[PDB]
C-alpha cells in the first residue's frame, strides 16, 4: 500500500485477489441459500422480520426469499436483482436461474485457479451459450392448431408448475382451477381481471372458482335484496354533494329566505340528476364513489339496487363480466350500453356477506375463493396460484413447449460438449465447465429426494448421448423414464430466459477486478 492516502476516512478498496474472493463467496452463498427449495421434494423457509413488527411468512418462492433478506455483499445484489426481474418477466424460474449463476461462478473460480485469463473464459462461455440456445430451439414442440392436444398440454404445464409448492397436496383439484380461469380470458393477457379472494376458515380443498362474480360491498337501506333478469348501469360520477361547481363562486344575499330558496334549488338539482339516471330503464346502479343518503332514498323509492364505493378495479372487472360501459353525464340514453345478468343475490361465506352475480353475459373476468386454516397457508396458496396463472398466460400467448425433469439441461450439455470436443486451446476447457454447470440442476433435484444422484445422472447422460432425447428423472420412483409419456412439460420462454439471464449475470460478475466503497451515510442515532 502506497504511503500517501488518496481516500477519505471510511473509504475502502479491494484489488484483484480479494475482489474475486469476495464476489465468489457472496455468489456461492446466495446460491446455496436457495438450493434447498428446488424440485418436487424441496422444503420451505420461515421468514420473520426483526424490524417490520415481527411479520411471519412461510414460503418456497425464490424471489420472495431473496427480496426479503438484508444482503450487503455487492456481488449478491446483482443476483437478487436478476431474480427479481426474472419474476417480473415470466413469473416462473426464479430459483433455477440463481442456482445456475452460482454454479457458473463456482466453476469459474477453479478455472481462474488454473491460471486462465477471464476473457478466455468469457469467450468460451459465449460460444457455449450460442450452441446451447440453438440446441434448445431445435427441440421445441409447437401445438395450438388442435384444441384437445393444446388443452392437454395446458393441464400438463399447470401440473408441472404446481408440483413443487404446497398446492401439490391436491394437485389435480387446483389444476382444474388454473386452466379454466385462464380460458375465461378469451386471449387477453390481463391478469388483473382474475380476482383472488382469500378468507380464513375451512379446508384447502374447499376452494373453488365461481361461475359468476363476487363483490365484497354493501347495498343501501330500503332497497331490494335480490333481482332477477337484471339491467345494470355502471357509472363513475359524483353523488355526494355532486355540485362541485368547480368555479370560485359564492352566495351573497341580504335575507335568510333567499338562502333557503337556494338550498331547495340545490336539492332539486340532485333530484333532476337522479331522474335522468333512471330514464335509462335500469334496476341496478353501480358507482365507484360514495352515494349520499338523499339519492339513496330516491333510488329506494324507485326500487333500484345501488352499489357504492366500488373502486376502479371493481368497475373495470364488472364491465368485463357483464358488458356495459362506464358512463357519465347521462344525457344520451341511446348511446350507452347496459350490462345484463340473470340473478343478483347475497351469499354468506365464513362470517361475511358478499354480492353474487349469476348468469352473466360475457364472463371475461372471474373470481377465485381460497380457503385455509392459517394466514400463511392462504398467502402461500395465492403466491403459487399466481405463478401458475402467469406461466399459463405466457404459454397461451406463445404455444411451444419443451420437456422437463432434466431433459432440457442434458440436451444443452450434450450440445456444448460436442462443440467443446471440436475446438483447440484453453477455450475448450472453459466450454466443458459450462456443461458441468448445466448438469448440476438435475443432480440437485435428485439430491433433494435422497436418490443416488451420481448413478442417475450417469444413466441420463448415457441415454442422451446415444439419441434418447426424451429421457428424464421419474421422481415418484426415482428412475429414468420417458418425459413425453409421463407428461412433464414446460414452456420454451421460461427455459430460454433462465439460460440467457444466468449466462449474462455470470459474465457481468466475472469481469470485475477492483471494488471501491465510499464512506457510508451514518444513521443519526441521537
Amino acid at each position: 500500500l502506497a504511503p500517501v492516502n488518496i481516500f477519505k476516512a471510511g473509504a475502502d478498496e479491494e484489488r484483484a485477489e480479494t475482489a474475486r474472493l469476495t464476489s465468489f463467496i457472496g455468489a456461492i452463498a446466495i446460491g446455496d441459500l436457495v438450493k434447498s427449495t428446488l424440485g418436487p421434494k424441496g422444503m420451505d423457509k420461515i421468514l420473520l422480520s426483526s424490524g417490520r413488527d415481527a411479520s411471519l411468512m412461510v414460503t418456497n418462492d425464490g424471489a420472495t426469499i431473496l427480496k426479503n433478506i438484508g444482503v450487503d455483499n455487492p456481488a449478491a445484489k446483482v443476483l437478487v436483482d436478476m431474480s427479481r426481474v426474472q419474476d417480473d418477466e415470466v413469473g416462473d424460474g426464479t430459483t433455477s436461474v440463481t442456482v445456475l449463476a452460482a454454479e457458473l461462478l463456482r466453476e469459474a473460480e477453479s478455472l481462474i485457479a488454473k491460471k486462465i485469463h477471464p476473457q478466455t473464459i468469457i469467450a468460451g462461455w459465449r460460444e457455449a451459450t450460442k450452441a446451447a440456445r440453438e440446441a434448445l430451439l431445435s427441440s421445441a414442440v409447437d401445438h395450438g392448431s388442435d384444441e384437445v392436444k393444446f388443452r392437454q398440454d395446458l393441464m400438463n404445464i399447470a401440473g408441472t408448475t404446481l408440483s413443487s409448492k404446497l398446492l401439490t397436496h391436491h394437485k389435480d383439484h387446483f389444476t382444474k382451477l388454473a386452466v379454466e380461469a385462464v380460458l375465461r380470458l378469451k386471449g387477453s393477457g390481463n391478469l388483473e381481471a382474475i380476482h383472488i379472494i382469500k378468507k380464513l376458515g375451512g379446508s384447502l380443498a374447499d376452494s373453488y372458482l365461481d361461475e359468476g362474480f363476487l363483490l365484497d360491498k354493501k347495498i343501501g337501506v330500503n332497497q331490494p335484496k335480490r333481482i332477477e333478469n337484471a339491467k345494470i348501469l355502471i357509472a363513475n360520477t359524483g353523488m355526494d354533494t355532486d355540485k362541485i361547481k368547480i368555479f370560485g363562486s359564492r352566495v351573497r344575499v341580504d335575507s335568510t329566505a333567499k338562502v333557503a330558496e337556494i338550498e331547495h334549488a340545490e336539492k332539486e338539482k340532485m333530484k333532476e340528476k337522479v331522474e335522468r339516471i333512471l330514464k335509462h330503464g335500469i334496476n341496478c346502479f353501480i358507482n365507484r364513489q360514495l352515494i349520499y343518503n338523499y339519492p339513496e332514498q330516491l333510488f329506494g323509492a324507485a326500487g333500484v339496487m345501488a352499489i357504492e364505493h366500488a373502486d376502479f378495479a371493481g368497475v373495470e372487472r364488472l364491465a368485463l363480466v357483464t358488458g356495459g360501459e362506464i358512463a357519465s353525464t347521462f344525457d344520451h340514453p341511446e348511446l350507452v350500453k347496459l350490462g345484463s345478468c340473470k340473478l343478483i343475490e347475497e351469499v354468506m361465506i365464513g362470517e361475511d356477506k358478499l354480492i353474487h352475480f349469476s348468469g352473466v353475459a360475457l364472463g371475461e373476468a372471474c373470481t377465485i375463493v381460497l380457503r385455509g386454516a392459517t394466514q400463511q397457508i392462504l398467502d402461500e396458496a395465492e403466491r403459487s396460484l399466481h405463478d401458475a396463472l402467469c406461466v399459463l398466460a405466457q404459454t397461451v400467448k406463445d404455444s411451444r413447449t419443451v420437456y422437463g425433469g432434466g431433459c432440457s439441461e442434458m440436451l444443452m450439455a450434450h450440445a456444448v460438449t460436442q462443440l467443446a470436443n471440436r475446438t483447440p486451446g484453453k477455450e475448450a476447457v472453459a466450454m466443458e465447465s459450462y456443461a458441468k454447470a448445466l448438469r448440476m440442476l438435475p443432480t440437485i433435484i435428485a439430491d433433494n429426494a435422497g436418490y443416488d444422484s451420481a448413478d442417475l445422472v450417469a444413466q441420463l447422460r448415457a441415454a442422451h448421448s446415444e439419441g434418447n432425447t426424451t429421457a428424464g428423472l421419474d421422481m415418484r420412483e426415482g428412475t429414468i423414464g420417458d418425459m413425453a409419456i409421463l407428461g412433464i412439460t414446460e414452456s420454451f420462454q421460461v427455459k430460454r430466459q433462465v439460460l440467457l439471464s444466468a449466462a449474462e449475470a455470470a459474465e457481468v460478475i466475472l469481469r470485475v477486478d477492483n471494488i471501491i466503497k465510499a464512506a457510508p451515510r451514518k444513521r443519526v442515532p441521537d
Binding site: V221, V259, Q297
Partner: protein, 308 residues
C-alpha cells in the same frame, strides 16, 4: 392464546389455528390446539426411527380420511322442531364456564334467539349480526334478559317526557337548524331593519319545519349524528317540547339498518318526504333507570316486527 404474546414462529401458527376454528364452529378452540400438539409430539419418534416427513404426511392424510368416515357413521340425525335436543346441546356447551350455575336461565334464552331470527323451513345458515349483545354493569348474572324490541343507551334530549304509549316513530337524516348551503354563503347587512328581519325569518324557518313534523302525528323522533352542522338547535328543541314530542339525538351512522329492520321505520332525508307512511308503530317507548348504573331506553311492542 391471543392475549399472550407467543414469540416462537411455530407457536405463532397455533393461535391462528384456533382463530380458524372460532370462525367455522365457535366451539372446540382448545381441543384443536391439544390435538395439533399431540400429533406433533407423536411425530418425533417417527422422525427418530428414520421415517421421512413426506411419508408421515401421507399417512396422516390417510388416517384423517378414515376418521372422518368413522365419526360420520357415529352421528345421529336431528330436526329443528325438537327443542329438547337444542336445549341439551346448549347446556352442554355452557357447563364449562363460570356461568354454568346460571345455565337454567341462559340455556333457553340462547335457543329462543336463534329461533326468532331464522326461518326454520328454509334456514341454511344464521346471521349473528341480527342478535345484539348489550353489556350493562350492576346487578348480578341472574338479571340478564331477552328484549323483543329495541334497546338504546343514549338519553332523551327532551326535558320532561319519558313515557309514550302507542308511539309513532320517525327517523330523520337532515338537520333542524339554520339554513346553510353547501356552497360558501354569507348574509350582508347595510341597514338596521335587516337585523330584525334576519331573526324573524330564522324563527319562521325553524317553526315551519317543526309544524310540518307535527302534522303527521309523530310522537318519538330519532335524529342521526351529524358532525359538520348542528343537527338540533335550542330553538327547535324548545318548539318540539312545546308540541309534546320526545326527541332522541346522536344516532350512530352504522346501526341505522338494524333500527329500520327492527321497528320498521323508513329513513327520511328530506322534509318533503316526511309523510305518515314512513313512520313505525310501537306499543311502548320509554326510558328506564337502573338503580345506580344509569339509564336505558326501551321500545317494545312493534306492530311490524323484523327478525332481530
Amino acid at each position: 392464546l391471543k392475549q399472550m404474546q407467543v414469540l416462537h414462529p411455530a407457536a405463532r401458527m397455533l393461535v391462528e389455528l384456533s382463530k380458524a376454528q372460532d370462525i367455522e364452529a365457535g366451539d372446540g378452540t382448545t381441543s384443536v390446539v391439544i390435538i395439533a400438539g399431540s400429533l406433533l409430539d407423536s411425530c418425533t419418534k417417527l422422525l427418530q426411527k428414520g421415517i421421512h416427513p413426506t411419508i408421515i404426511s401421507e399417512s396422516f392424510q390417510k388416517a384423517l380420511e378414515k376418521g372422518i368416515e368413522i365419526l360420520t357413521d357415529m352421528s345421529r340425525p336431528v330436526e329443528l322442531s325438537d327443542r329438547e335436543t337444542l336445549l341439551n346441546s346448549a347446556t352442554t356447551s355452557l357447563n364449562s364456564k363460570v356461568v354454568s350455575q346460571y345455565s337454567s336461565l341462559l340455556s333457553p334464552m340462547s335457543v329462543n334467539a336463534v329461533m326468532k331470527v331464522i326461518d326454520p323451513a328454509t334456514a341454511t345458515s344464521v346471521d349473528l349480526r341480527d342478535i345484539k349483545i348489550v353489556k350493562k354493569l350492576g346487578g348480578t348474572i341472574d338479571d340478564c334478559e331477552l328484549v323483543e324490541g329495541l334497546v338504546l343507551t343514549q338519553k332523551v334530549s327532551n326535558s320532561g317526557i319519558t313515557r309514550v304509549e302507542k308511539a309513532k316513530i320517525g327517523l330523520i337524516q337532515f338537520c333542524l337548524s339554520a339554513p346553510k348551503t353547501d356552497m360558501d354563503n354569507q348574509i350582508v347587512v347595510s341597514d338596521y331593519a335587516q337585523m330584525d328581519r334576519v331573526l324573524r325569518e330564522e324563527r319562521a324557518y325553524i317553526l315551519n319545519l317543526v309544524k310540518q313534523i307535527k302534522k303527521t302525528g309523530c310522537n318519538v323522533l330519532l335524529i342521526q349524528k351529524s358532525i359538520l352542522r348542528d343537527a338540533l338547535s335550542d330553538l327547535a328543541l324548545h318548539f318540539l317540547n312545546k308540541m309534546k314530542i320526545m326527541v332522541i339525538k346522536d344516532i350512530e351512522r352504522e346501526d341505522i339498518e338494524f333500527i329500520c329492520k327492527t321497528i320498521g321505520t323508513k329513513p327520511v332525508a328530506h322534509i318533503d318526504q316526511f309523510t305518515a307512511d314512513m313512520l313505525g308503530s310501537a306499543e311502548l317507548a320509554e326510558e328506564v333507570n337502573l338503580n345506580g348504573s344509569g339509564k336505558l331506553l326501551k321500545i317494545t311492542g312493534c306492530a311490524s316486527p323484523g327478525k332481530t
